[PDB]
């Protein structure tokens, strides 16, 4: 209950709206899901003319055919349609106005209904504030609306990217509650999943991926370059096989604290003895030479993505750094660099703020970089080791500079699990050289990788990964849908005879039929639900359906609208003005049959035919012959 | 209990099977025909479906949307509103009392609102009203717990669960009756015994508290005494075969339920009074669904006939023995260059194949070189784990044979060059359509399809000219 | 499978329906030879032959023919109780209003056989281990139920 409505409850309000309703799927007014409401002309405070309303357009540019404005309804619909983009370049376009009796009905396309209703309310308020007060602030409300969409089930980077790609490829998708997933198809050609996880991913491989230790051992037993470690344990001159772990063994010397070594790249055993004897002075015998072995310390961290066994996209992660003279280090420099044109909170911004925390300070005190230091030079300082993308760490594209050997290694690693998307992190000195002659390491592999960083990198060019993911399952338009038949009025017996006639040709198909008094699978009877659209949803969820037959009358059409979109074959007898709306949602190779009294009209894609019906003849005989060409 | 049954079935059907360390799994098959698993879980099962199966109170809504009999109820504090809701909750309901209970009326009520009037009148009157007025109009649930198993979407086997029971004589307490029952030969502890022992815990303490004398007095052979509300097959309870007494309607219902998930085996728990009647005319209810059920109770029932479910599980994947093998070639002394030449020669007819070759000098996977492990007989495992292999080429000399032995079983083409006494054993394990080539000095002996041939090579010739014409058989 | 031919089993059938079934089958395999036997006569393709007095001898005579491609036979209660069946296994079983004795015809089947049972106006079909049940309407004969099921034979 919105008691504020016009929050400043100024009595001179000149416009009124009411009767808001949500229409999923197709509807009598539009061709997609929408929100519908009614205009009005509240009296005694006559609205100033259109000219000044159109004049204040400094924010957005609705233009070009803007001369077509005939009343306030078209203006209002256009401005709500423009604000519906939410300053995000959404694929939501569409609007309709219908003047009936003395009122105009407005239909606005929507994806999340709550945000569209909020948009309508806000734009109505802005419109009201145009005549009397002459000022209104809308950026704050726009930001709140953007956050509202962000916190929705349809809101999300990967989710919305996949939805946009599916819309661009004209692939059905819809949300399934109870389960809580998204479904990309109809009948047997269906795919379900959440984010980057899908239903074709094994339960065993995903569990194994998180084992870490056993995964490392399994990877090392196949000869892959992994951080081997072999503990820290020393046996005086152990060396030999213990040192003969790999090429450029390069035992790195940590022990107690900081140092040296990293020069056993020369495999000379005498060099190893010299480093063991001369440099064991650095850390005294207080530590039993707890010395780590290769450590593959290259200081450059990369992430690689594999889809369907192939390698796509690569990215290098860099933490935040600072530059400048010795003013002080904490606060002043980060604060002024926070005030940067590129470091905004808008989703169009490449990256967020520095957002210092306590683990950052722990790293600072670990090295002793101080808090308010004096670094008066152009000396750059890195404030964090692990590049956290949510705390100022950024990413750079590295896709076009990878040596083929690393690609081969990544593909070989990928082709060992039954997952669809795999993400491998590596540490390398130069990605342009082979891993055989360069220090290399493999730290982690992940089964649920976030592909956001590959879509809009801070520096570089975008790459389309979502296209590859959808190509993995579907390859064209035809491998997403199933034959659908639409009726206006039908009974159970006619449905049974039609199903039998269809089954006479293909005897192994599964056919679903839905009408007003029963639901049929092949020839058996099931239970019907009170909500009419849930039956269609359940029939479309079936993983074995081959053909759908649906009866849609005027009541259901006006109440909530259709659920599907195609209607390959349409049969109509005695249609109302609303019931004709089924004739516009057809494909090129469709077939529409119309009966009007004693007149029969065939609207086959080839030619238009008309004929005069006989006595005691039935439309059964009319379609029972055209059913011969469905697939 | 299940792993060994699967192993025995695989041995019966001549299917290779071996254990994978570093992974904790068992693998059946060799190349692209492999299947990995543990107990009744396999690599083709889905992740989100298996996670959804364990989220209770959400599967109930999913199974209630599509019209299925599930237990649901309501809470009321008034009179007419209850009667209203009960109609939409389904009419064959039971009213029951809140906490007063008295001896619970339950008030089975069949088809009438007037029966509802009488039922709630007795409920509010007889049961004390001091407690809350939460008159919970619920469904009617019977006893006789059953468990159904579905494999590949088809109904296979069913089993009734029955808890342990005791009877009285006239001069003995319950404990001595328990001891007498335990003395019975049937309830022994051999691994191979139908029924187990009877134990003690708090559960039967609460059960005795509900009704009955608590470890005192005598029953006097009037009736039997139960110990638990749940069978608990690990101790006391047992199972009865009920596969042949199931109505077709329940079978169709089970198939409809099972067709919606991407799992190989599914288990359904059901409560009903009669399993031989349709669920549309009795008290039926679905309780739980399990994704990784145990199938031992269907193989060794207490009384009844066994059902072979492991045969169905295995036949789901492999139709016959040849559907789980790949071509294998065995040498006893070879070099890398010859392996490369053989691979390139083979690749001309099948350009989209993947071939794996291993010897004492290095590994080769389709014109490439990889790292050779130090432990022989491990590279063979790594090559047989690859899910894309189409052909294997391996070498086994005398040292390898005397160290651990061969890893696979059977060969399609055997090539020997000046063999010793030990290496000749490589000719023992062959099929009936295999080809064998032996060279000694300049003498060549060939066995092909059971037919023998012998001739003599002259100088300046190599064995590579002999087996390059026999490569067309494995194609 | 290299030593067997397809077999179809009825429990009650007339000589007019066998000709229609053979005609329908021969449309897809014009060069086949089909042998059918019942209590009224014996047919090879569409021609009539002589019937023996001992019923089980006709099946032996048909299985001895070195050109047969498919067999159709019926076994009622008296035949089953007299001497029993002659072959082992079936690929398609049709039962119309069966009795207690005749139900044993469903015991000897393979893993991909088809079973059809009609009782009153109720039809039960088992196909590849999957069950299905529905109801016929008024003027209807079983001939239109099993005439769509002959695709597994091929």
From TrEMBL, chain C:
Keywords: Metal-binding. It comes from the Bacteria. This is RimK domain-containing protein ATP-grasp. The lineage of its organism: Bacteria, Bacillati, Cyanobacteriota, Cyanophyceae, Pleurocapsales. The chain holds residues 483 to 636 of 636 of the full protein.
């Amino acid at each position: 209950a919105v008691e504020p409505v016009r929050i400043n409850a100024r009595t001179t309000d000149v416009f009124d709206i009411f009767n808001v309703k949500q229409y999923v799927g197709a509807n009598p007014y539009l061709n997609q899901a929408a929100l519908v409401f009614d205009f009005a002309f509240t009296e005694s405070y006559q609205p100033l003319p259109i000219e000044n309303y159109l004049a204040v357009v400094g924010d957005r540019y609705p233009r070009l055919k803007e001369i077509e404005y005939q009343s306030y309804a078209e203006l209002f619909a256009s401005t709500v349609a423009e604000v519906n983009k939410l300053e995000m370049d959404l694929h939501l376009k569409g609007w309709n106005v219908k003047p009936i009796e003395e009122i105009n009905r407005i239909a606005i396309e929507s994806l999340h209904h709550r945000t569209t209703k909020e948009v309508v309310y806000c734009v109505w308020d802005w419109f009201e504030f145009i005549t009397q007060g002459e000022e209104f602030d809308l950026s704050k409300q726009i930001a709140i609306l953007q956050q509202l969409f962000r916190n929705s089930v349809y809101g999300g980077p990967t989710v919305y990217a996949l939805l946009r790609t599916a819309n661009e490829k004209h692939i059905p998708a819809f949300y399934l509650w109870d389960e809580g997933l998204m479904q990309y198809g109809y009948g047997k050609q269906q795919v379900r999943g959440i984010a980057t996880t899908f239903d074709v991913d094994s339960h065993i491989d995903s569990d194994f991926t998180t084992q870490k230790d056993d995964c490392k051992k399994f990877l090392q037993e196949l000869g892959f370059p992994v951080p081997q470690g072999d503990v820290v344990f020393s046996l005086a001159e152990a060396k030999e096989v213990a040192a003969e772990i790999g090429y450029p063994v390069a035992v790195k010397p940590v022990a107690g604290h900081k140092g040296i070594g990293v020069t056993a790249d020369v495999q000379d055993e005498i060099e190893l003895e010299a480093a063991y004897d001369r440099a064991v002075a650095g850390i005294p015998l207080e530590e039993k030479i707890c010395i780590i072995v290769e450590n593959s310390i290259a200081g450059h961290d990369y992430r690689l993505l594999c889809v369907n066994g192939r390698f796509v996209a690569a990215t290098e992660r860099k933490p935040a750094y600072v530059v400048g003279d010795g003013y002080s280090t904490i606060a002043e420099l980060i604060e002024k660099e926070n005030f940067s044109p590129n470091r905004s909170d808008t989703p169009t911004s490449p990256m967020g703020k520095i957002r210092t925390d306590e683990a950052m300070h722990l790293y600072l005190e670990e090295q002793g970089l101080d808090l308010d230091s004096v670094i008066d030079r152009d000396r750059t300082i890195y404030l964090r080791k692990v590049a956290n993308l949510s705390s100022g760490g950024f990413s750079i594209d590295a896709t076009n500079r990878v040596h083929p050997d690393n690609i081969i290694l990544a593909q070989d690693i990928a082709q060992h699990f039954r997952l669809t998307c795999l993400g491998i992190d590596i540490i390398t000195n130069d990605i342009g050289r082979s891993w055989k002659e360069t220090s290399f390491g493999i730290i982690e592999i992940n089964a649920a990788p976030g592909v956001y960083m590959h879509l809009k990198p801070a520096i570089g060019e975008p790459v389309d990964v979502t296209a590859r993911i959808l190509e993995t399952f579907f390859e064209t338009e035809k491998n997403a849908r199933i034959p659908i038949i639409t009726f206006n009025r039908v009974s159970i017996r006619q449905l049974q005879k039609l199903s039998d006639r269809i089954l006479m040709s293909h005897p192994d198909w599964t056919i679903g039929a839905v009408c007003r008094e029963g639901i049929l699978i092949n020839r058996s009877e099931k239970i019907l639900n009170r909500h009419y659209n849930t039956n269609v949803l359940n029939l479309l969820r079936n993983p074995k359906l081959d053909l759908l037959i649906a009866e849609y009358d005027e009541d259901a059409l006006e109440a909530e609208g259709m659920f599907y979109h195609g209607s390959n074959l349409v049969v109509l007898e005695d249609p109302s003005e609303i019931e004709m709306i089924l004739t516009r949602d057809v494909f090129s190779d469709s077939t529409v049959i119309i009966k009007q009294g004693r007149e029969i009209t065939i609207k086959r894609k080839g030619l238009l035919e008309q004929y005069e019906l006989e006595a005691e003849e039935l439309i059964e005989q009319v379609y029972l012959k055209e059913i011969g060409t469905i697939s």
